Amino acid sequence: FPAPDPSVLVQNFNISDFNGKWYITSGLNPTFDAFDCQLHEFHTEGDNKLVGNISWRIKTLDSGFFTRSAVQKFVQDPNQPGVLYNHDNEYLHYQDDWYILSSKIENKPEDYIFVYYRGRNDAWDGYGGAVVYTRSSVLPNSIIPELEKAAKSIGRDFSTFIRTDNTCGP
Amino acid sequence: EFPAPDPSVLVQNFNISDFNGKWYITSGLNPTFDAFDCQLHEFHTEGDNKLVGNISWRIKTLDSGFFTRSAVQKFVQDPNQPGVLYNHDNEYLHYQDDWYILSSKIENKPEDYIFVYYRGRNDAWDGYGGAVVYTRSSVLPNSIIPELEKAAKSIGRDFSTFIRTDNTCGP
Ligand SMILES: [Gd]
Ligand SMILES: [Gd]
Ligand SMILES: [Gd]
């Protein structure tokens, strides 16, 4: 997961377009929760920040667990609108960086944002992947050509991505 | 143990099509470590008898990897007891999940709720169960709490012990 060339990122991006409900309907590097509900609702904070809810779990010596909600907040790069940083993490001690490869926002059913992500913490510096957020719970057929072009721009191939439609859903 | 509840304590009328659409689980008697992940479920009705939604299946393999799949889970309503729904139904998955509707208010208002007590079994264990509140809202409404306390009481439980999980899909 090397950082992308700045030239392959969207050159303009308004973090306000991340507001509200988005489904993750495709991903490069899924986990075993790939088919659980993939709805995320985000909120903008001010000018340059995006906020959403995350969850924290510890597994203890009795086979029990403790869990908590937390926030994850991203700040946009002031020179590269397609780069967002979440370093931000206090007790949690990790960094997650987002790179917007491709996006179409027409306030239409087919709107999407394609994010490549990379991360690190004390245990490992290898974290990363790529996900497609769509307004629709079903990835729209019409956006696949642009997704294929975006994936190819970072040396990937979109046909390798897992497809996860209607994950909450009807 | 989660025994079968007294039939008299269940809702005496229930229309399964009232389960259609989007519901959030905003409270539960016994959570798993995924309690704070998004608790949105979208249900639909099949025929006039059956409630359907999407579930997920995982296996963890010897190499530390995994395989996963979407599946569906289908409930049928008991014809004599509107508040009893059965998911036996399950093919190669080999499990049973029974739902007992303790309390519900459906008025097509933001505070609508359905309070489900559940019990289950598979080859590994017969001890599965718990109780969850489905709400139309992503936040459990303060106004339904006295009915929930009463419903919890009817099966020998206390609503105050339940986990509260508001805004689980985002702020
Ligand atoms: Gd990699
Ligand atoms: Gd750095
Ligand atoms: Gd029990």
Curated annotation (Swiss-Prot), chain A:
Interacts in vitro with LTO1. It comes from Arabidopsis thaliana. Belongs to the calycin superfamily. Lipocalin family. Part of the xanthophyll (or violaxanthin) cycle for controlling the concentration of zeaxanthin in chloroplasts. Catalyzes the two-step mono de-epoxidation reaction. Stereospecific for all-trans xanthophylls. Zeaxanthin induces the dissipation of excitation energy in the chlorophyll of the light-harvesting protein complex of photosystem II. The amount of VDE in vivo is estimated to be 1 molecule per 20-100 electron transport chains. This is Violaxanthin de-epoxidase, chloroplastic. Signal peptide: none annotated. The gene is VDE1. The cysteine rich N-terminal region is required for activity. Disulfide bonds join 37-168. It is found in: Plastid, Chloroplast thylakoid membrane.
Swiss-Prot record, chain B:
Disulfide bonds join 38-169. It is found in: Plastid, Chloroplast thylakoid membrane. Its main location: plastid. GO terms for cellular component: chloroplast; chloroplast thylakoid; chloroplast thylakoid membrane; cytosol; extracellular region; thylakoid lumen. GO terms for molecular function: protein domain specific binding; violaxanthin de-epoxidase activity. Keywords: Chloroplast, Coiled coil, Disulfide bond, Membrane, Oxidoreductase, Plastid, Thylakoid, Transit peptide. One of its GO terms (biological process) is xanthophyll cycle. Part of the xanthophyll (or violaxanthin) cycle for controlling the concentration of zeaxanthin in chloroplasts. Catalyzes the two-step mono de-epoxidation reaction. Stereospecific for all-trans xanthophylls. Zeaxanthin induces the dissipation of excitation energy in the chlorophyll of the light-harvesting protein complex of photosystem II. Interacts in vitro with LTO1. The cysteine rich N-terminal region is required for activity. The amount of VDE in vivo is estimated to be 1 molecule per 20-100 electron transport chains. Belongs to the calycin superfamily. Lipocalin family. This is Violaxanthin de-epoxidase, chloroplastic. It comes from Arabidopsis thaliana (Mouse-ear cress). The lineage of its organism: Eukaryota, Viridiplantae, Streptophyta, Embryophyta, Tracheophyta. The gene is VDE1. The chain holds residues 194 to 364 of 462 of the full protein.
